[PDB]
Amino acid sequence: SGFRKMAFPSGKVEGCMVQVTCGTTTLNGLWLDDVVYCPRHVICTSEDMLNPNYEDLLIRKSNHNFLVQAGNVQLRVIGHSMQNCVLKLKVDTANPKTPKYKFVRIQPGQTFSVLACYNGSPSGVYQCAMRPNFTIKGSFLNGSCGSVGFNIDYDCVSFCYMHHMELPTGVHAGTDLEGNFYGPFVDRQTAQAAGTDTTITVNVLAWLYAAVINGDRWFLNRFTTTLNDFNLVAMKYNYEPLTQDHVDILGPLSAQTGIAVLDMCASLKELLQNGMNGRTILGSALLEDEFTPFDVVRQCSGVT
Amino acid sequence: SGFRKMAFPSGKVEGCMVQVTCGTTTLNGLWLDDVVYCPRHVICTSEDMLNPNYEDLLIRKSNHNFLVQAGNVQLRVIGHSMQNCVLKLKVDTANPKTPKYKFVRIQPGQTFSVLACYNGSPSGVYQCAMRPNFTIKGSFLNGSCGSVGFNIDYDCVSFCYMHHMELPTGVHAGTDLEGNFYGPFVDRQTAQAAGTDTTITVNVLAWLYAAVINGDRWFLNRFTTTLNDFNLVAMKYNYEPLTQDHVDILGPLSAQTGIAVLDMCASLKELLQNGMNGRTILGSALLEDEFTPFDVVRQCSGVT
Ligand SMILES: COc1ccccc1OCCNC(=O)c1cncc2ccccc12
Ligand SMILES: COc1ccccc1OCCNC(=O)c1cncc2ccccc12
């Protein structure tokens, strides 16, 4: 028992981390096979950042200007190309530590592990969610660009995120591994509206099921609700509307606990309307939305 | 910016994880050099667990009875010995992936990363603290025994914990890597008093400094206090007494923020006496005590 914000083991990803330097800027790259992927803003200086013309800036750079270092050894760059907001540096050596991997575009509300890196060196690993507004509430400092988010299924690493910038609001924005930003964000130093965020309702319900599995049951009540009634409450409290697809994804947890999804919705409705009254659930004094139903079952079943 | 419950990258530790089977019991072992370390209860059946005579049970076992598998390959056991509550299985092959490492006994209130494992395979990594009462609030299921806790300084892994059991209360107990239990716990299936836990005051203060560094400042007030006055409040709220050694450890964060330690104590006193009033600090609705002053500076400085 016990329920923690558990990240995937970061080993397979640590072996892919490299340092990429261009001019005076250094950030992290992801070395998979004979390609190094990094944020395209590695080619910017500081006068550039307000509105960079990436095409023009990249034209001034040659393969030899991209310094790629994997631990203590230098990689030879034999090609460079820009795909959306990422640079793809072809190197002459395939990474011997390349795990089985895929590039995936995650959906808002899904979770992933982030391996925070500086100068191509891993400093820490944490679990987070892609917010409904396509920002991530990460922990990143100067030099963390190129740090990636991922999920792992047995031996396959599904890379879903590459860190690009921190918005003036202190939340983080980045791309999928094809360089497409999640959300409306652009790789420019300008004020960018993140847009209204909501709480990931299906995740809160999954976490409420995790609480019951792990002994915390004080919030269970004698009530039930309908999807429509629950969604009126979800709207008032800036929660995402619950759909039957979400009820269906919660099926396994409902069967495990014997608590119907709509019955758990009525518990959540009561917690939203009455608060926690100074109590806690799984060591938290607020409703947690960074665990998916899959994460709850994975953590409660011990999938390696 | 941003502040997360960040774990150390688990790669160096993943490379040490093996599966140890003895009779019908399978758990995890830690393979460092030519030694595999695992909990001694691997030799117990089920009738044994209520009060095992470990010496007698081990006498019936021979080197060939300990099956040690590292991924897909079998390790040859050439020696076995019991040191406190751990078994040390000498193998004929030194682990090629052995990182630089030390075995350390952590102090209560200190933090560490746990790599949860099942069948010698890593499933996840999370950060936690050794509670003042020498339990850990982990996330462990059947088969997680032998999973370890550690800290990493540059290239050196300091192993501090090996998981042994879950108490009837749902909290976890284990040993240092010499097999000495943290706390009064014994490796028997009996009810064991964990003893009164307290909140790690120096850690809450460190986390309050992290909040200020990351923009959350609503809790800063116009007050100050003395160590004696603060400790009367800490006693009432089951917080550990703050000592000058704790004030000294908070020195760097006090200099960084320009907020005197006793001034931050007065903020903490007010939060303890008035609660949060429905507000949050670093995404938490309670006072967090699982970040040490060293962790706060490490996360806020990007040490790799
Ligand atoms: C506004 O910056 C950019 C805009 C567009 C494109 C790139 C921008 O950044 C480039 C450098 N950024 C970082 O290294 C950074 C990343 N995350 C967290 C941080 C926290 C404090 C200081 C810096 C960072
Ligand atoms: C009372 O058990 C023991 C007592 C003394 C010595 C050993 C004991 O356990 C041996 C097996 N234990 C585990 O595999 C275990 C570890 N953590 C979390 C769990 C959650 C649910 C079920 C089992 C576990």
- SS3 of chain A: the string is CCCCCCECCCHHHHCCEEEEEECCEEEEEEEECCEEEEEHHHHCCCCCCCCCCHHHHHHCCCHHHEEEEECCEEECEEEEEEECCEEEEEECCCCCCCCEEEECCCCCCCEEEEEEEECCEEEEEEEEECCCCCCECCCCCCCCCCCEEEEEECCEEEEEEEEEEECCCCCEEEECCCCCECCCCCCCCCCCCCCCCCECHHHHHHHHHHHHHCCCCCCCCCCCCCHHHHHHHHHHCCECCCCHHHHHHCHHHHHHHCCCHHHHHHHHHHHHHHCCCCCCECCECCCCCCCCHHHHHHHHHCCC
Residue partners of B149: CB distance under 8 A and separation at least 6: B106, B112, B113, B114, B128, B136, B159, B160, B161, B162, B163, B174
- C-alpha distances in angstroms, A75 versus A11, A78, A92, A96, B256? 21, 9, 7, 13, 38
Residues B116 and A6: beta-carbon distance below 8 Å? yes
Shortest-distance ligand to the CA of residue A189: 1
| Residue reference for tokens 């006693």 | B235
**CA-only gyration radius of chain B, Å:** 21
d(CA A32, CA A18): 10
d(CA B22, CA A198): 50
d(CA B87, CA B74): 18
| Residue reference for tokens 């409420």 | A208
**What amino acid is encoded at B277 in this protein?**
N
* Residue B28 dihedral angles phi and psi, to the nearest 5°: -100, 150
**CA-only gyration radius of chain A, Å:** 21
Nearest-CA residue for atom 20 of ligand 1: A141
Is the minimum CB–CB distance between B3 and chain A shorter than 8 Å? Answer: yes
Q: Sign of torsion, CA B279 A289 A191 A125? A: positive
The whole-angstrom distance between residue A295's C-alpha and the CA centroid of its chain comes to 14
The 10 Å Cβ neighbour count of residue A26 is: 18
* Residue B111 dihedral angles phi and psi, to the nearest 5°: -110, 165
Q: Which one of the listed residues A16, A22, A38, A41 is annotated catalytic?
A: A41
Contact B170 A285 (CB under 8 A): no
Residues 116-175 of B with CB under 8 A from A: 116-119, 121-126, 128, 137-144, 166, 170-172
Residue partners of A216: CB distance under 8 A and separation at least 6: A280, A281, A282
**Which residues in A177-198 are b (16+ Cβ under 10 Å) and which e?**
bebebbbebebebeebebeebb
Query: Residue B279 has which token pair?
Result: 């507000």
Residues 199-228 of B with CB under 8 A from A: 214-215
Query: Residue A220 has which token pair?
Result: 């269970």
Residue partners of A139: CB distance under 8 A and separation at least 6: A116, A124, A126, B1, B2, B3, B4, B6, B299
The whole-angstrom distance between residue B21's C-alpha and the CA centroid of its chain comes to 25
Residues A95 and A80: beta-carbon distance below 8 Å? no
Largest CA distance in chain A: 69
Closest CA to B139 of A7, A143, A126: A7
d(CA A174, CA A112): 13
What is the CA(B302)–ligand 2 centre distance, in A?
A: 37
Residues of B in contact with A153 (CB under 8 A): none
* Residue A290 dihedral angles phi and psi, to the nearest 5°: -100, 25
Q: Report resolution (Å) to 1 decimal.
A: 1.6
Residues A259 and A220: beta-carbon distance below 8 Å? yes
| Residue reference for tokens 């994804």 | A249
d(CA A298, CA A291): 10
Residues A75 and A69: beta-carbon distance below 8 Å? yes
The 10 Å Cβ neighbour count of residue A28 is: 30
Is the minimum CB–CB distance between A44 and chain B shorter than 8 Å? Answer: no
Active site residue A246: no
d(CA B284, CA B4): 11
d(CA B188, CA B50): 6
d(CA A265, CA A230): 7
Residues A261 and A247: beta-carbon distance below 8 Å? yes
Shortest-distance ligand to the CA of residue B175: 2
Question: 3-class secondary structure for chain B?
Answer: CCCCCCECCCHHHHCCEEEEEECCEEEEEEEECCEEEEEHHHHCCCCCCCCCCHHHHHHCCCHHHEEEEECCEEECEEEEEEECCEEEEEECCCCCCCCEEEECCCCCCCEEEEEEEECCEEEEEEEEECCCCCCECCCCCCCCCCCEEEEEECCEEEEEEEEEEECCCCCEEEECCCCCECCCCCCCCCCCCCCCCCECHHHHHHHHHHHHHCCCCCCCCCCCCCHHHHHHHHHHCCECCCCHHHHHHCHHHHHHHCCCHHHHHHHHHHHHHHCCCCCCECCECCCCCCCCHHHHHHHHHCCC
Residues 253-272 of A with CB under 8 A from B: none
Query: Residue B290 has which token pair?
Result: 């699982």
Query: Residue B88 has which token pair?
Result: 């040390």
Is the minimum CB–CB distance between B278 and chain A shorter than 8 Å? Answer: yes
Contact A126 B304 (CB under 8 A): no
What is the CA(A287)–ligand 1 centre distance, in A?
A: 30
Query: Residue B129 has which token pair?
Result: 């603290």
d(CA A46, CA A127): 31
Contact B304 A144 (CB under 8 A): no
Angle ∠(B90,B94,B95) on CA atoms, nearest 5? 110
Closest CA to A144 of A22, A26, A49: A26
What is the CA(B181)–ligand 2 centre distance, in A?
A: 15
Q: Which residue of A has its CA nearest to B122?
A: A304
CA atoms within 13 A on the CB side of B205: 30
> Measured in Å, how far apart are chain B's first and last C-alpha atoms?
16
d(CA A265, CA A271): 10
Q: Which domains does chain B have, with CATH numbers?
A: 1-14+100-197 (2.40.10.10), 15-99 (2.40.10.10), 198-301 (1.10.1840.10)
Closest CA to B209 of B148, B160, B282: B282
Residue of B145, B147, B171 to mutate, ligand 2, most atoms within 8 A of C-beta: B145
Experimental method: X-ray
d(CA A36, CA A105): 19
The 10 Å Cβ neighbour count of residue A147 is: 28
Residue partners of A153: CB distance under 8 A and separation at least 6: none
Closest CA to B173 of B24, B41, B7: B41
Nearest-CA residue for atom 22 of ligand 1: A142
Q: Sign of torsion, CA A284 A286 A290 A296? A: positive
Is the minimum CB–CB distance between B244 and chain A shorter than 8 Å? Answer: no
d(CA A126, CA A7): 5
